[PDB]
Scaffold this active site. Structure first.
Site, PDB file in Angstrom:
ATOM      1  N   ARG A  87    -105.342  76.014-120.763  1.00  0.00           N
ATOM      2  CA  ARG A  87    -105.463  77.831-120.732  1.00  0.00           C
ATOM      3  C   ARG A  87    -106.276  78.145-122.292  1.00  0.00           C
ATOM      4  NH1 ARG A  87    -101.367  81.795-119.943  1.00  0.00           N
ATOM      5  NH2 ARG A  87    -101.995  81.239-117.490  1.00  0.00           N
TER       6      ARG A  87
ATOM      7  N   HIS B 228     -93.597  86.024-129.925  1.00  0.00           N
ATOM      8  CA  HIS B 228     -94.069  85.236-129.856  1.00  0.00           C
ATOM      9  C   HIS B 228     -93.512  84.266-130.643  1.00  0.00           C
ATOM     10  CE1 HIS B 228     -95.928  84.191-125.759  1.00  0.00           C
ATOM     11  NE2 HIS B 228     -96.564  85.873-126.038  1.00  0.00           N
TER      12      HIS B 228
ATOM     13  N   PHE C 225    -109.450  84.145-128.948  1.00  0.00           N
ATOM     14  CA  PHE C 225    -107.971  84.081-128.748  1.00  0.00           C
ATOM     15  C   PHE C 225    -107.272  83.786-129.436  1.00  0.00           C
ATOM     16  CE2 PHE C 225    -109.578  87.995-126.500  1.00  0.00           C
ATOM     17  CZ  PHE C 225    -108.730  89.207-127.165  1.00  0.00           C
TER      18      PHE C 225
ATOM     19  N   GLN D 220    -104.220  77.478-125.542  1.00  0.00           N
ATOM     20  CA  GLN D 220    -102.888  77.016-125.287  1.00  0.00           C
ATOM     21  C   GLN D 220    -103.070  75.704-124.277  1.00  0.00           C
ATOM     22  OE1 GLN D 220    -101.321  80.665-122.443  1.00  0.00           O
ATOM     23  NE2 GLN D 220     -99.957  79.716-122.236  1.00  0.00           N
TER      24      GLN D 220
ATOM     25  N   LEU E 133     -98.294  89.709-130.172  1.00  0.00           N
ATOM     26  CA  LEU E 133     -98.076  89.374-130.437  1.00  0.00           C
ATOM     27  C   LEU E 133     -96.621  88.831-131.524  1.00  0.00           C
ATOM     28  CD1 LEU E 133    -100.337  85.775-128.461  1.00  0.00           C
ATOM     29  CD2 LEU E 133     -99.092  88.306-127.459  1.00  0.00           C
TER      30      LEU E 133
ATOM     31  N   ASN F 194     -94.100  81.094-123.804  1.00  0.00           N
ATOM     32  CA  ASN F 194     -93.326  81.307-122.843  1.00  0.00           C
ATOM     33  C   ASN F 194     -92.781  82.355-122.047  1.00  0.00           C
ATOM     34  OD1 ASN F 194     -92.645  84.371-123.891  1.00  0.00           O
ATOM     35  ND2 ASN F 194     -92.651  83.739-125.596  1.00  0.00           N
TER      36      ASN F 194
ATOM     37  N   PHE G 269     -99.408  77.816-128.563  1.00  0.00           N
ATOM     38  CA  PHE G 269    -101.384  77.881-128.692  1.00  0.00           C
ATOM     39  C   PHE G 269    -101.519  77.802-130.056  1.00  0.00           C
ATOM     40  CE2 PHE G 269    -100.459  82.540-129.537  1.00  0.00           C
ATOM     41  CZ  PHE G 269     -99.037  82.568-129.552  1.00  0.00           C
TER      42      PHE G 269
END
Ligand SMILES: CCn1c(-c2cc(N3CCN(C4CC4)CC3)cnc2[C@H](C)OC)c2c3cc(ccc31)-c1csc(n1)C[C@H](NC(=O)[C@H]1[C@@H]3COC[C@@H]31)C(=O)N1CCC[C@H](N1)C(=O)OCC(C)(C)C2
Ligand SMILES: Nc1nc2c(ncn2[C@@H]2O[C@H](COP(=O)(O)OP(=O)(O)NP(=O)(O)O)[C@@H](O)[C@H]2O)c(=O)[nH]1
Ligand SMILES: [Mg+2]
Lengths: 167, 164
Positions: free
Chosen positions: B54, B125, B59, B62, B121, B101, B112
């Site tokens: 991903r 995370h 951003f 991942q 986040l 997660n 990531f």
């Protein structure tokens, strides 16, 4: 050319929006948990004697990004509002989804179906009567589904198309 | 001394370059050690050969699903999942290395690398490292991402390990 219907599947995380959509499109039950960012699918179907093309937007059930839903609610023509019958919180979350759709589209009359998913599961915490009463108060159909067994899957999407056609 | 690990990244099997990470063992030792051991492969499994499944430009990148290679898997060296160690460190900008997660206390192996500040986040995370060298490799990986994260080429960890 066949008419296209822009359907949008919304609801809390984990209720089975993706499993329902992939069951419809691919005839396969996704057992794993792959939380969605955003995915789109296409499928042609025949509903009440007329072939049409379903464009289905499968959305995230992430509470952190509730403000980011406006953009896809603007473009969608009809909405499956999905909860899981073993997850009372997901049922309570339905009100917020419906209110957001009404607000974004500035209408009290948006094509919409209430979907109670995971009906294959034994330990139900949301009774069918509760959801039937809620759907009646919204003026929309209620359909119980299982993405696992396929029960009601076609019915849910096709009923939403009927709601759009009758709008 | 915090450990340093490297990934040699490939794009459709061809070398792209090396990114190295400092792991903040001084603040999150359990989480740092998981990533360290997964990078050396010394438990008999780990990141080598796995992909960045991903990538969302603007951003993050991942990866870390070396068990199913589909974004749903991965496992820690402590069991399938382990608890959130702490949230002391924040997602302050590009290069932050943090655990993916599935909700509270579900750290496995997916991680990531931020390519921007992702402040929302924080507290959700566990941040446990940062890019040390090769941030431009992570920027180059962004070239193969998309709005929903699906990648346009296969972005793999062709090799990985620990640096002296
Ligand atoms: C609403 C759309 N949308 C966005 C988003 C949001 C925003 N804004 C703009 C406004 N901004 C405010 C000014 C501050 C806020 C953000 C813009 N544009 C977008 C995108 C591009 O529109 C398509 C996101 C986002 C994230 C999710 C779902 C939808 C999302 C999502 C699903 S699952 C998850 N998040 C956590 C995920 N869990 C798993 O993968 C579990 C799998 C199974 O068990 C192991 C493994 C996980 O740990 N990470 C590791 C961390 C980054 C994270 N993924 C991820 O991908 O975030 C993507 C993204 C783009 C950063 C956020
Ligand atoms: N027994 C059963 N499990 C289901 C059903 N639908 C989905 N699940 C399971 O519930 C989990 C979540 O399903 P998923 O389709 O990913 O839900 P989602 O609503 O798309 N989640 P998100 O909002 O994060 O994208 C998966 O483990 C899936 O197999 C169903 O009808 N019955
Ligand atoms: Mg989904």
């Amino acid at each position: 050319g066949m008419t296209e219907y822009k359907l949008v599947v919304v609801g809390a995380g984990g209720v089975g929006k993706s499993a329902l959509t992939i069951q419809l499109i691919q005839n396969h039950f996704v057992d794993e948990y792959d939380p969605t960012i955003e995915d789109s699918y296409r499928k042609q179907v025949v509903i009440d004697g007329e072939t049409c093309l379903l464009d289905i937007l499968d959305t995230a059930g992430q509470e952190e990004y509730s403000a980011m839903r406006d953009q896809y609610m603007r473009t969608g023509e009809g909405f499956l509002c999905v909860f899981a019958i073993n997850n009372t919180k997901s049922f309570e979350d339905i009100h917020q989804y419906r209110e957001q759709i009404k607000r974004v589209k500035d209408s009290d009359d948006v094509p919409m179906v209430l979907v109670g998913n995971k009906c294959d599961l034994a330990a139900r915490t949301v009774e069918s009567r509760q959801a039937q009463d809620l759907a009646r108060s919204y003026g929309i159909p209620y359909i119980e589904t299982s993405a696992k067994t396929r029960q009601g899957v076609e019915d849910a999407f096709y009923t939403l198309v009927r709601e759009i056609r009758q709008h | 001394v915090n450990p340093t690990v490297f990934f040699d990244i490939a794009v459709d099997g061809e070398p792209l370059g090396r990114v190295s990470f400092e792991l903040f063992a001084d603040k999150v030792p359990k989480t740092a050690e998981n990533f360290r051991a997964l990078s050396t492969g010394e438990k008999g499994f780990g990141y080598k050969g796995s992909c960045f499944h991903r990538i969302i430009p603007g951003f993050m990148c991942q990866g870390g699903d070396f068990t199913r290679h589909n974004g749903t898997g991965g496992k820690s060296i402590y069991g399938e999942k382990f608890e959130d160690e702490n949230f002391i460190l924040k997602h302050t900008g590009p290069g932050i290395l943090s655990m993916a997660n599935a909700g509270p206390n579900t750290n496995g192996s997916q991680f990531f690398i931020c390519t921007a500040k992702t402040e929302w986040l924080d507290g959700k995370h566990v941040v446990f490292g940062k890019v040390k060298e090769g941030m431009n490799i992570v920027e180059a990986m962004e070239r193969f991402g998309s709005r929903n994260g699906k990648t346009s080429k296969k972005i793999t960890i062709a090799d990985c390990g620990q640096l002296e």
